[PDB]
Amino acid sequence: GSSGSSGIKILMPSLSPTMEEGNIVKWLKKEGEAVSAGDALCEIETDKAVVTLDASDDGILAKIVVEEGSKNIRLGSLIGLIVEEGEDWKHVSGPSSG
Numbered sequence: 001g002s003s004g005s006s007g008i009k010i011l012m013p014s015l016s017p018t019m020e021e022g023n024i025v026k027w028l029k030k031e032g033e034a035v036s037a038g039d040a041l042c043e044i045e046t047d048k049a050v051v052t053l054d055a056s057d058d059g060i061l062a063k064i065v066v067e068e069g070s071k072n073i074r075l076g077s078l079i080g081l082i083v084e085e086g087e088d089w090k091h092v093s094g095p096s097s098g
Contacts, residue, residue, distance in 0.1 A: 008082035012075045015051045021074040033061050062089045
């Protein structure tokens with residue numbers, strides 16, 4: 001089949017200076033909601049302390065790969081994708097765009 005897309009994959013940031021993994025306590029955003037750089041997305045758990053995952057870019061919470069409650073979230077792990085505000089996060093389709 002065929003299905004191309006271009007979104008923003010969210011990978012576990014190196015919140016800590018020497019962190020091997022994290023733990024999403026609770027998502028501060030929901031799927032379909034907008035996102036703004038700086039704003040808190042979710043709470044990342046770390047040995048150091050309780051840190052929060054801030055948005056690096058502004059977009060719509062396409063989906064959430066890793067939901068809250070997960071523990072031991074190594075780095076470079078997709079926890080959710082973002083979609084340019086407007087884009088049919090749910091599912092795009094029609095004459096234009098796909």
